[PDB]
From a paper:
A notable feature of some SLC6 amino acid transporters (B0AT1, B0AT3, and SIT1), is the formation of a heterodimeric complex with the SARS-CoV-2 receptor angiotensin-converting-enzyme 2 (ACE2). ACE2 is a membrane-bound peptidase involved in the breakdown of angiotensin (II), the processed hormone that regulates blood pressure. The related transporter SIT1 is found in a wider variety of epithelial cells including the brain. Mechanistic studies demonstrated a 2Na+/1Cl-proline symport mechanism and the position of the chloride ion is consistent with previous predictions of the ion binding sites in SIT1 (27).
A pharmacophore-guided screen identified tiagabine as a potent non-competitive inhibitor of SIT1. To understand its binding mode, we determined the cryo-electron microscopy (cryo-EM) structure of ACE2-SIT1 bound with tiagabine. The inhibitor binds close to the orthosteric proline binding site, but due to its size extends into the cytosolic vestibule. This causes the transporter to adopt an inward-open conformation, in which the intracellular gate is blocked. Nipecotic acid is the core of the tiagabine molecule and is a substrate of SIT1 and GAT1. Consistently, the nipecotic acid fragment of tiagabine is in the binding site of SIT1, extending into the intracellular vestibule. In GAT1, mutation of Tyr60 has a major impact on the binding of tiagabine. This residue is equivalent to Tyr21, which coordinates tiagabine in SIT1. In our experiments tiagabine inhibited SIT1 with a non-competitive mode, excluding a competitive mode of inhibition. Binding of tiagabine to the cytosolic face of the transporter could kinetically appear as a non-competitive mechanism because competition with the substrate would occur on the cis-site of the transporter. Secondly, we present the first inhibitor-bound high-resolution structure of the ACE2-SIT1 complex, which may have implications for its role in epithelial cells in the brain, lung, intestine, and kidney.
Numbering used by the authors:
A (entry chain B): 626 to 721
B (entry chain D): 626 to 768
C (entry chain C), D (entry chain A): 12 to 583
The structure:
Amino acid sequence: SALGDKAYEWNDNEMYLFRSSVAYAMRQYFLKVKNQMILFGEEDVRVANLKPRISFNFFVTAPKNVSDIIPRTEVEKAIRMSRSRINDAFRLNDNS
Amino acid sequence: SALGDKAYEWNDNEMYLFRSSVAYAMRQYFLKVKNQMILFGEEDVRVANLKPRISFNFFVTAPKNVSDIIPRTEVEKAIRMSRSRINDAFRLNDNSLEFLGIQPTLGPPNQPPVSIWLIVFGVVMGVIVVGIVILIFTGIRDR
Amino acid sequence: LQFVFACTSYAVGLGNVWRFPYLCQMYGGGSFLVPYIIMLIVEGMPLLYLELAVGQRMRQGSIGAWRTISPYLSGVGVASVVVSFFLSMYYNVINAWAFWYLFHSFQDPLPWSVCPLNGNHTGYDEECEKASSTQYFWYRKTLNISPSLQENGGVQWEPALCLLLAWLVVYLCILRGTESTGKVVYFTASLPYCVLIIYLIRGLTLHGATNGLMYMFTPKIEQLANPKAWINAATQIFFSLGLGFGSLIAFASYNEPSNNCQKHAIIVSLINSFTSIFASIVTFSIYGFKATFNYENCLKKVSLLLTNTFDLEDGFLTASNLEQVKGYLASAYPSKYSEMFPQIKNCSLESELDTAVQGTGLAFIVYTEAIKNMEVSQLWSVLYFFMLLMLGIGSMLGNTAAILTPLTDSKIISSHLPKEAISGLVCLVNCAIGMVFTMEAGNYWFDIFNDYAATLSLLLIVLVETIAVCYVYGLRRFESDLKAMTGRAVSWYWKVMWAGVSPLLIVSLFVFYLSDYILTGTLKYQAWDASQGQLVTKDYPAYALAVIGLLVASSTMCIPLAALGTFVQRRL
Amino acid sequence: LQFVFACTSYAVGLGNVWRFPYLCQMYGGGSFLVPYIIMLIVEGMPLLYLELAVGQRMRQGSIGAWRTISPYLSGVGVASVVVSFFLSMYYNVINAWAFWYLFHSFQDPLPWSVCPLNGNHTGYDEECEKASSTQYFWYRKTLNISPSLQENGGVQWEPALCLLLAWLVVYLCILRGTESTGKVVYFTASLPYCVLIIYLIRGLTLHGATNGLMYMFTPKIEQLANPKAWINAATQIFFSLGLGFGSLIAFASYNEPSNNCQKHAIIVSLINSFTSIFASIVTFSIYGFKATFNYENCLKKVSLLLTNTFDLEDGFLTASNLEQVKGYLASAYPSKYSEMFPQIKNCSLESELDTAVQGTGLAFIVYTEAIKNMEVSQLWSVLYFFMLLMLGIGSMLGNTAAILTPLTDSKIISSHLPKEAISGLVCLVNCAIGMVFTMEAGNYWFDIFNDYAATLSLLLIVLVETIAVCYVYGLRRFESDLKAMTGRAVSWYWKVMWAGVSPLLIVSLFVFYLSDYILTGTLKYQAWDASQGQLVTKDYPAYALAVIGLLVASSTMCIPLAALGTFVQRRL
Ligand SMILES: *[C@@H]1O[C@H](CO)[C@@H](O[C@@H]2O[C@H](CO)[C@@H](O)[C@H](O)[C@H]2NC(C)=O)[C@H](O)[C@H]1NC(C)=O
Ligand SMILES: *[C@@H]1O[C@H](CO)[C@@H](O[C@@H]2O[C@H](CO)[C@@H](O)[C@H](O)[C@H]2NC(C)=O)[C@H](O)[C@H]1NC(C)=O
Ligand SMILES: *[C@@H]1O[C@H](CO)[C@@H](O[C@@H]2O[C@H](CO)[C@@H](O)[C@H](O)[C@H]2NC(C)=O)[C@H](O)[C@H]1NC(C)=O
Ligand SMILES: *[C@@H]1O[C@H](CO)[C@@H](O[C@@H]2O[C@H](CO)[C@@H](O)[C@H](O)[C@H]2NC(C)=O)[C@H](O)[C@H]1NC(C)=O
Ligand SMILES: Cc1ccsc1C(=CCCN1CCC[C@@H](C(=O)O)C1)c1sccc1C
Ligand SMILES: Cc1ccsc1C(=CCCN1CCC[C@@H](C(=O)O)C1)c1sccc1C
Ligand SMILES: *[C@@H]1O[C@H](CO)[C@@H](O)[C@H](O)[C@H]1NC(C)=O
Ligand SMILES: *[C@@H]1O[C@H](CO)[C@@H](O)[C@H](O)[C@H]1NC(C)=O
């Protein structure tokens, strides 16, 4: 829809890049708001229900604590802050 | 130089993003060229000599093998392939992300297919000769 | 009414816009305006109006006027004719260049806007880094100027054929003879100014344009010391007014012998000076903008080099604090700083401004610069090139009307030859002799024919005319406060120039010119020097001196020949 | 020569550009083109030429002509004057709207190009996804049309204004009286066509334009059945040519009594038809483009909804394979497919094309659509609006000349009243009575004054005129094939169309129209229905029927009044 042509194939590397970007956004939110240093990693972003539509569910946990789940509201706020920086990473325009 | 204003401050998270992007580029090169499956990680991109100019040396190793250093030429090829995808990640335009050994060049501009000046001068010279001939003929006819 | 003024506008030409700004730039700007004002207020008016009066009263050509005054005085018209023909050959090349630029102004993106890439396809040409895109286009794309005058190459293909096209255009305009009109002249006189307003607006709306204004306005002291400015200004004003060519006299003879010629002269001079000043303003605004841009680029390059070397934080090193940072860095690391010093450059705003673009084709390499940052470049480019073309065509039409008229009375040859055939032969001969400005080194020949010792015999022609008027045949027996000049402005105080100080004025700067010629004993011409990208000075060869000497002699020795030609008949 | 054609080009008006395409769209397009031609050859030409000849031969005003023929035929001119007045009141509002659009065409970015956002600031207004930006601008920003005629609101501010400013412009144009000219007519006639070429070019460069042309050319069967298309085409051609107004006759009087009036009539009719056809081409191209775009959006929305619902790969589901994928998905998961079936829509190109934009202001909402996708919208917008304004001004000048003439002869009042005061009083009276068209539901009243019971008496005027001609006063006692009228049109078979078929044709469609009027027993006016974004039909109220009946009766009973007046003379 966005690129029309020259669209890169969505392989595992794209998912890795997406997870790293999400972790970067979470780090930025926890640094510039709560004044805390949390070292998130790409393994802290759990993904599920991968679809050919490139649609999936995801969530974020503590750096090394499986039994700790970040509440959805804070993740939503972080995504709100860093959506502009996420968009150009994949050449998308907030409509795709 | 690139953004001028609204430039984000360079903190550790930017370095993390850069390392992840480099690992992604290396994965792409090792997948789409040599047909091998290598799981690079951000911890396999060693960096050193950080300066306020945002200048630093770096290199890449094997997934879990310290004594294995990827030779420089393959890294150069991977960067050459994925520079376009790296540049827009940080909103740079290849003028503020020089790699000191990789110069960009793609697309020789060759616009003119017909040399418009030649055909324009041709039509003008044709019209001027026909005009001068018809005028001299009219003058002769008018004695 | 307004029709008289619209008709009188025709006095503007391709010397006020093409040639005046180049001279103004060449001699410092502000130091060049005041001699122009003096020469206009003391020299142009008396000679112009006296001529006009002579043309009105004599009712005949300049040759017949010379016969009326003195058989010895014959030949001045012949010298003026030769001067006009010499002017015409190198004049038409300006129209040729205008045609070339107009034809090339149809491509997109426009040329002289981007630079050809190097053979590596990894960067731009080093010549473009040295000389800007406009300079590269005007020196290598359209002229291919040789490094030195001594070196010469074969004739080129585009300039020759374009010159031919312009010459046939001139020939057609002569043959049609559809010059008489009364309504389109309004449009032809209004187009130049209305075209110039757009460029004035764009020049004034750009950053740094005011620096050009201070440069061209503020006079200097050292520049005024040189005498060559005075002779150059006198030649410029003579060329612009056109006196001494024998064309005015004609016109005046054409019109009815009852008109206030003095009002015509003053209204011509005022509009000429005003148009010249307006054009100088418009050009120098863009020139100052370009100089400021180059100075900023110099500062940016130096800043980038320093930042890369010393790894200073970006943006911290600004233009204002350059000296403090330089001193602090020299203190911090004196050894490597001293080693790097020779590699360091220093921006110089003043030297850059007074010498940024120079040479004959200044107006071509400035406005094209302005073209490269238009909203729609092609439109205004076409309008400006069309205005230049029409002005050049009008000027060519003139000096032709000037050349043809004396040869028209030659019934001895015209008895078996129609005037059209003679005009065509003259046009072809002049086109052929103008071919010498189309090789890789013809540009230097063109500057010699236009600037260096060019049309200087006009000064001696005017001097001879005024001394002839000052004799007993003038204001003592003939033109002695007669009623025939409409009974007004009869023997007023204006004589104190045209019968008084003006002759001396002619020799006052001539003596300075000849004194400097022998004192210096050296002449320098500008060379392109593509190896660096800036013009340099070189010495003229001996044969150049010989050819310029014979050129001035050809118009100098005419009167002594007529003296003997009359004395031989007087003997019997 | 060319001046004759330039003068006859004043036959063009707003009945060719603003009203013809609206009617063409209203009645199916192609099915409306063919009757017009049949009503062009047999109806307009003979009646127009006969009138013109009668006006030329009579050499006096229409009222005096009627008195000369018989006291029985007196009064028809009064009905014509009343008809012209009623036309003018609702005609000036078009100029008012054009002024409004021109005034609003100065902003940047232009309106009707982007849509105002919702009160949440997150999305667009729901009205915009219902109706496009141009439709929203024309229906809510500049009209604020009420949902129904029964609903009423206060008189608005901006329309009344535009109407007042336009009316004072018209009054000034009347007072100056600078109608006589022979040089500007070239420009006033060249502007319309030259402006239309640019829009034709743009329409041809837009995707999907061919479908609009095919729609406008291909006739239909269902539309041709109704007689209302025929009567509306007859009214359209009558209004465009101007029969029954009494202005042509008056023109003739000034015209020199030596000219082939048949040549004039054919040369005006052909020009009018050609201009109308050209305008219809230009409008329907853009209309087809808009319809195609809406159809594509309809397809895209359904495709996106299906892809999101069933998680199909993007780009895989195309328009070509839509039906196959629909059937396959219905087969695969019938339950939830049937559940969400009501959310599916079918994109019907034909039904979207025949009903895409409708109503009176079609020409306003189409060209503006063609404006928002131009490189420099403001330029062509200004040219188009200025052309519309000047054409409306000329038409209003003609109407004012028609209305003013009968009141001029009233010496009883003009003895102590200047003509300027009478003209001003008439202008203000017409403006005040036309204030109703500036009120919130006034658009319905405007459509009433334009379509229903509007200018229907014109056919009756034509019928009584040709009946009077068919009597002894035509071809039998007066104008009996006399040689006085240049010896032409003397008992030619041309007389046949104005003595044969046409008088029968006046009543041929009348009976058909009144047959359906009573048989159907229903009548619908279109309304905006902002809740959905599409026009819907509603029934006229009783008082609307009463008012249109009174309006038609006001022009109907004029003849019986004259009959009663002359009955006393008839009896004795
Ligand atoms: C990992 O996360 C869990 C839950 O966030 C932490 O458990 C907290 O501490 C005790 C442990 O039973 C509970 O009573 C608290 O309710 C827990 N807090 C919350 C918000 O649920 C656990 O301590 C964490 N472990 C580490 C090593 O960080
Ligand atoms: C890590 O990379 C080094 C470098 O290749 C590997 O060391 C080599 O081991 C092979 C046999 O496996 C020897 O033939 C080479 O002589 C070794 N070095 C060289 C020069 O390649 C090492 O095996 C890799 N893996 C680990 C766990 O260290
Ligand atoms: C830049 O720095 C200064 C300013 O021009 C130059 O230093 C000059 O060095 C010359 C040669 O010894 C001295 O004669 C001058 O006195 C120094 N300063 C001046 C006033 O010029 C230096 O050469 C410049 N670097 C360049 C031009 O490359
Ligand atoms: C146009 O789209 C409508 C959508 O309603 C379709 O109408 C359906 O008609 C079928 C039978 O032909 C019914 O079984 C459905 O209940 C209707 N759709 C609904 C209400 O869900 C129709 O398929 C399309 N074509 C026409 C001519 O209407
Ligand atoms: C000033 C004036 C007053 C009445 S005429 C007249 C013109 C003489 C100078 C114009 N050119 C003379 C040659 C150079 C040319 C240029 O540099 O462009 C200008 C003449 S002379 C014959 C016709 C006309 C208009
Ligand atoms: C056709 C013709 C031939 C000679 S005149 C003339 C014109 C009559 C119709 C024009 N309008 C009549 C009213 C409506 C208007 C419009 O819809 O725009 C057009 C007249 S009548 C008085 C002046 C002119 C030019
Ligand atoms: C370009 O020319 C050759 C080909 O790449 C190369 O060796 C040389 O270094 C380059 N020099 C430039 C930049 O002109
Ligand atoms: C927008 O604002 C209106 C008015 O308060 C409100 O009714 C509606 O729910 C809002 N819609 C949103 C939040 O998009």
